[PDB]
């Protein structure tokens, strides 16, 4: 990466001013005479002791153990920005009561306890307590800064050759938070950095500003393509979360200090708008955050399969050859992707007239293979009087504008391009309607969309993005809205895929830029990584940090985007990707072709084995994503989420969990002969899913590996559903029978769930057409019951096999099903591995049933 074109905090004038304020006595103080207790909130005036500027604090206790702090100017010359469309609803409030007061302090009680907020007057300060335990403090280090709007580098400011007219002057806001007892913080993606966030005292702050960074490097706090201003704090005793609802450029400082971590947010404009999510468990934090910004959109089943992509496939014949290559080499694949060379000179919604002259027939061929296609649609529109999309947006004034009133023009893939104002709802409605089958000619129901460069990337712009002083809907500057521009693109695109079907089909949209709330609209990936072992390793902490903040549909380009991976690296990347949520191979324009059958047979076979494992686990993946959709729980999880009291797991990032059932430690080193797998949990057992060998926790097990090894362990007490009949795509498999893998706890128990529906519509929600099954084992009986009775489904899916790990040989096996006579099942038992296989139960997955081992 060339670091010179991207600002450090010193080169950012508002970061320099804010970060120059150091911990000390705050000049802000609360005017307790102005105190008011409104219906939904508490309001009190704040004053700067030197400048006499008057601010208004709006303090709210919220349902679900949350507090919201908002600070705006009392009488501003012009309104400050407040982030719209991110919150899914107005958060239900809880009543505040004054429960204590003196000359310099007011104590507040949220509802009837146990949460209390102490407002200190001089100096201004907020403390949050459960009973008498101090949870969090606000402005304890006195770092609050609120630059008020003055009379229209503090003003006009230049970086390189680009000039920010800055017509409103300095308007930055900042605030600090103290987390007593916390030594580990996580979140604020996206950064190519470790899962556990590092202290920023002797270096740069973490930066949140959606930017396109060419050949990004590892282990540094430079801002990447997406920004989610959510930080999580974990200790042995409690979990906390901070949600800084600001859409402008934001810098975050982290300092450690009895152990305590301090966090300081510094934003360029808007109001102060922060949510304190009080836990106490990390899953409470998930629920708290999900109630604010929503949950992961339920992906259509196909999008959880394997995606085959590159820049670029030449033509329809090439796409069909790739399709046939998967079948001819017995490798599953659901989607083939079309990068920017498929369009007419990077005019999106078009097709190259020579290389893609009949897209419908290409899409029909893929449909006959029961496969899908993804076409890229970027948010920059070529300035071209012959380009209908450009003419309509120009004629309807839907472009981002400059201060003189003309449409902004930058440089991107098609050369000179303009940028639709996606903050304008009329523009988003236009965009969404453009995806109708009449408007997007050549599109079909099995064509899906990829949104790239939506930071927005502007090749001739400052830091390769849009000028700060561009003007959007309502007169707001680009500096006010920057970090939600990508989300609006993702949102309008996803809505378009829904509308084009009459509101029936679920969308799939991959997006590069993102914000809080992007999980509602599809998937994200970590952009342009590199074919190197360290980039392989860093995929885990990057997606894990996105998982913790609600973005569960995450991945990194399998094989690396830049450069050519050696065959061993590509194999290890397929094994890593096969156990990560979004699973796509992608490659730069000048890389060699690396479709998985172009490798030597020994490398092909390990890749095929990794693909088979992924497709077999689709019922498991699908259920984890339904739980993410209903509860807000991440699919890919750090070990400390499942073992919050094991302090040796607080920094692990070469290992992760899928739900609570599978622990994954992929090989990420060339020529490795083994791996060190930490199996946590006291009184816990883990099963090597390849050898069925049981292991007791906690321990660090040395596991020898070969080229084909994917170290995966199933936790005792869990039941994992699998499709053991791998077919060429997920559409081919979605009526197939299920095999249940029961991993017995030391107490002889296990439990698990299974979600099923048609695989691609909203019928599960509009018509309750779905199944949610509970599988439970205790004593010597396996029972299937309904975990949601409202859901019914016509499906031929049945239970063809049950594999029980950690069981002795029974004398007989008896199955009971409602509506059927009592049946006897034959079985097979391995005394060495204690694995029991129940043959062909033959019962419908929609039926209640029980299997008893005598």
């Amino acid at each position: 990466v060339d670091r010179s074109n991207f600002k450090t905090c010193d080169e950012s004038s508002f970061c320099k001013r804010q970060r120059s304020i150091r911990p000390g006595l705050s000049p802000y103080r609360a005017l307790l005479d102005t105190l008011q207790l409104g219906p939904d909130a508490l309001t009190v005036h704040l004053i700067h002791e030197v400048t006499k500027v008057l601010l208004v604090l709006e303090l709210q206790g919220l349902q679900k153990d949350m507090t919201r702090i908002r600070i705006d100017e009392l009488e501003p010359r012009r309104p400050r920005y407040r982030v719209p469309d991110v919150l899914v609803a107005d958060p239900p409030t809880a009543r505040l009561s004054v429960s204590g007061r003196d000359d310099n302090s007011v104590e507040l009680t949220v509802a009837e306890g146990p949460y209390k907020i102490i407002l200190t007057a001089q100096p201004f300060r907020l403390d949050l307590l459960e009973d008498r335990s101090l949870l969090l403090s606000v402005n304890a280090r006195g770092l609050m800064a609120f630059e008020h709007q003055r009379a229209p580098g503090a003003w006009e400011e230049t970086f390189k050759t680009h000039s920010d007219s800055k017509p409103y002057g300095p308007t930055s806001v900042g605030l600090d938070f103290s987390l007593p007892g916390m030594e580990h913080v996580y979140g604020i993606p996206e950064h190519a950095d470790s899962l556990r966030l590092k202290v920023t005292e002797g270096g740069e702050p973490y930066r949140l500003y959606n930017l396109d960074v060419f050949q990004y490097e590892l282990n540094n706090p430079m801002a990447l393509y997406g920004s989610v201003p959510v930080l999580l704090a974990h200790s042995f005793h409690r979990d906390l979360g901070i949600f800084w609802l600001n859409a402008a450029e934001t810098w975050v400082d982290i300092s450690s200090n009895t152990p305590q971590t301090d966090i300081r947010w510094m934003s360029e404009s808007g109001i102060i708008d922060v949510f304190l999510m009080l836990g106490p468990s990390v899953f409470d934090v998930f629920r708290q955050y999900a109630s604010l910004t929503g949950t992961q959109a339920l992906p259509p089943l196909f999008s959880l399969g394997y995606h085959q992509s590159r820049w670029n496939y030449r033509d329809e014949a090439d796409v069909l050859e790739v399709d046939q290559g998967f079948d001819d080499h017995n490798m599953p694949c659901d989607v083939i992707w079309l990068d920017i060379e498929h369009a007419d000179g990077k005019r999106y919604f078009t097709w190259d007239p020579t290389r893609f002259p009949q897209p419908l027939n290409m899409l029909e061929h893929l449909a006959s293979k029961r496969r899908k296609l993804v076409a890229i649609v970027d948010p920059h529109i070529k300035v071209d009087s012959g380009y209908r999309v450009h003419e309509e947006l120009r004629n309807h004034g839907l472009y981002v504008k400059t201060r003189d009133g003309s449409d902004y023009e930058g440089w991107c893939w098609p050369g000179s391009a303009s940028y639709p104002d996606f903050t304008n709802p009329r523009m988003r409605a236009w965009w969404s309607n453009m995806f109708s089958f009449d408007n997007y000619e050549g599109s079909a129901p099995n064509l899906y969309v990829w949104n790239d460069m939506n930071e927005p990337s502007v090749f001739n712009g400052p830091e390769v993005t849009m000028l700060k002083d561009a003007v959007h809907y309502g007169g707001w500057e680009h500096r006010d809205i920057h970090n939600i521009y990508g989300l609006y693109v993702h949102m309008a695109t996803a809505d378009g895929l829904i509308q084009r079907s009459g509101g029936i089909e679920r969308p799939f949209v991959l997006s590069r830029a993102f914000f809080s709330g992007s999980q509602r609209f599809g998937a994200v990936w970590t952009g342009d990584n590199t074919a190197e072992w360290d980039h392989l390793k860093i995929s885990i902490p990057m997606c894990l940090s996105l998982a913790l903040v609600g973005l569960s549909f995450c991945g990194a380009d399998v094989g690396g985007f830049f450069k050519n991976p050696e065959p061993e690296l590509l194999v290890r990347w397929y094994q890593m990707g096969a156990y990560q949520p979004f699973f796509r191979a992608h490659a730069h324009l000048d890389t060699g072709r690396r479709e998985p059958w172009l490798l030597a047979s020994q490398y092909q076979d390990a890749i095929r084995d990794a693909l088979f494992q992924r497709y077999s686990l689709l019922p498991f993946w699908y259920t984890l994503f339904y739980q993410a959709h209903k509860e807000g729980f991440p699919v890919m999880r750090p070990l400390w989420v499942q073992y919050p009291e094991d302090m040796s797991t607080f920094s692990i990032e070469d290992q992760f969990m899928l739900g609570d059932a599978l622990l994954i430690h992929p090989v990420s080193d060339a020529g490795a002969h083994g791996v060190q797998v930490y199996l946590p949990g006291q009184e816990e057992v883990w099963y090597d899913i390849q050898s069925y060998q049981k292991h007791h926790g906690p321990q660090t097990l040395y596991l020898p590996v070969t080229l084909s090894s994917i170290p995966v362990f199933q936790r005792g007490g869990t039941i994992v559903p699998r499709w053991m009949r791998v077919r060429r795509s997920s559409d081919c498999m979605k009526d197939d029978p299920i095999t249940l893998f029961v991993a017995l706890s030391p107490q002889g128990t296990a439990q698990g769930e299974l979600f099923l529906d048609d695989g691609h519509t909203f019928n599960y929600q509009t018509r309750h057409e779905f199944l949610l099954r509970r599988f439970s084992f205790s004593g010597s009986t396996l029972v299937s019951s309904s975990a949601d009775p409202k859901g019914h489904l016509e499906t031929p899916i049945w239970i063809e096999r049950v594999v029980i790990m950690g069981a002795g040989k029974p004398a007989a096996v008896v199955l009971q099903t409602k509506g059927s006579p009592e049946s006897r099942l034959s079985f097979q038992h391995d005394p060495e591995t204690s694995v029991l296989i129940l043959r062909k139960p033959g019962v419908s997955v929609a039926s209640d049933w029980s299997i008893h081992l005598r």
Binding site: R725, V726, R728, P737, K840
Partner: protein, 87 residues
């Protein structure tokens, strides 16, 4: 009166009653007990394909919704009706 014999796998790994041949569950390690279903991972399905060359396909492509044989006999219970295209 009379009786009926059992079926044995072509690799001799087992012997099963004939009601477990094509019963949509894999009992033979070589897949020989399910030549007409998709139950075995290593099985094969035979397209007779009258009017063209006969063909062997993977068992996993039986009733997958995709027309693999020109005579369409690989799709007999999947919802995909395959026209005969052996010409």
């Amino acid at each position: 009166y009379e009786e009926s014999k059992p079926f044995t796998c072509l690799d001799g790994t087992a012997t099963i009653p004939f009601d477990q041949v094509n019963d949509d569950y894999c009992d033979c390690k070589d897949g020989s007990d399910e030549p007409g279903t998709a139950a075995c991972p290593n099985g094969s399905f035979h397209c007779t394909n009258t009017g063209y060359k006969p063909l062997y396909i993977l068992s996993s492509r039986v009733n997958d919704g995709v027309c693999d044989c020109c005579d369409g006999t690989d799709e007999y219970n999947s919802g995909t009706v395959c026209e005969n295209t052996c010409r």
